[PDB]
């Protein structure tokens, strides 16, 4: 009965772990099925109203969208929301960032990040009246440096928009925003 | 194009 | 010894729960790689004699394609074959169907579908004379109004190919056919 | 007891079983997450210096990329290097070669392999002065035949690159190296 | 091009 116990005990934890695995797995076949490398993103972000809530609480102040590419082996990137706003727009504005990431061939690119970017607000209405920004990346910025740990610096747009206009606008549709980020990739080798 | 049944 | 009894039937339960799920993850693993985003689907289907045999004897009517794209978030879509045929062609032909599903990113996207399809079952003999149809979709048919369910209305051709036709011809090789669809990506966001 | 004992041994049975469809699954997302569509392999080889004594040993003679393709349902390839060499180059050279593979689509596409190939070794140093060799395809090597299993006979250059130069140059960082790989993909008719 | 051993 002691053995018994033993092995029922060895069994359990395993049968932890298997779980955390198998939960890890939804999470990367997520990231794979959402992924795109021609340097275009396109974030669905659902559940707005409770996630804005959860910003303005303080528990979850920012968002990361999934990474996104360049091309097959080119910079990893990603984009940060903030649904009730930081810096000069903290409460007032929804912001706006851009991400570069660590990625694999990094020893292959070019350095610093120079390709211009453009940030994007989707307007799910017949109009399609889509709000966006662009930049050129200042070389000075250690936003665009080669990354040293996992995420540079984000870098964009702290007062994107207003939080009256996105919430009066027909950019939320059934609890949902789109945010688009395009990164001009006609520079690169492919 | 017809649909299916 | 109770307690045990317990315990043991907890683990066997959750050892069911990880076989499902571990099943569900293959399948989803055969999805992914035999995704396409630029609106090119080539289908392959193995085990003609036994997978027709069953659509005669009314086990399974019909086959799903895994789904494609027109970009890494366009409209989703899939093909539908009937072995033993479907509607007016039921017993004598192999029917061949466009399926719009529902995509993630439809709140983006014009409706109606209005691209251009294309429906082939290729040739695998040096001829590489494969049997082919295109249609402009409709814009009044339900089969190309935004999604509200899964799937759509399934649109094409219930007399795509005899069936004499199809198995006197060099379409089948090693019990195995091959479908092409494509859809048309050229006047859209890219 | 005897009862009890025996669902142990069943449950560690199928335990150890999941234990090695998990571990199969982390190396099947991670062949799809370094997957490429477009004819272009960037192979990035950690641990360079073990891996070259595991050659010298003779306990790994050569590694093999993970899969590529020109497509999304065409030709699946691959590259085998020797850290340590091979034929003629054993013991003084780098030896790079290429793989065809047997693809799920082989009935579909011209035979035999006829694609111009280039292989490279980066050059990860600030010059970037690449080391690369192209080559056409003999007709009548079984190298290019279409695949009876699952690779033909490997092809490529014995004599690569000199040992003595790859490793007093700029193309080992961080004892890593980068293999590129280019198939011609302009003359394909999807 | 040369195959392998």
Redesign the interface.
Known sequence: ?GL??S??SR??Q??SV??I??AD??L??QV??T????G?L?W?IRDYKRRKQEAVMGKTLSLYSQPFYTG??GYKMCARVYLNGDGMGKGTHLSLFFVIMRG??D??LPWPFKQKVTLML?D?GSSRRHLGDAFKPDPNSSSFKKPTGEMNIASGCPVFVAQTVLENGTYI??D?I?IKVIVDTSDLP? | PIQAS
Chains 1, 3, 4 share one sequence.
């Open positions: 009965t018994l116990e092995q029922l069994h359990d395993m049968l298997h779980d695995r198998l797995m939804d990367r076949f794979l099925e992924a795109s490398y021609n275009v396109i669905k097959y082996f694999e061939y020893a292959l989707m799910q549709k059934d949902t789109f492919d």
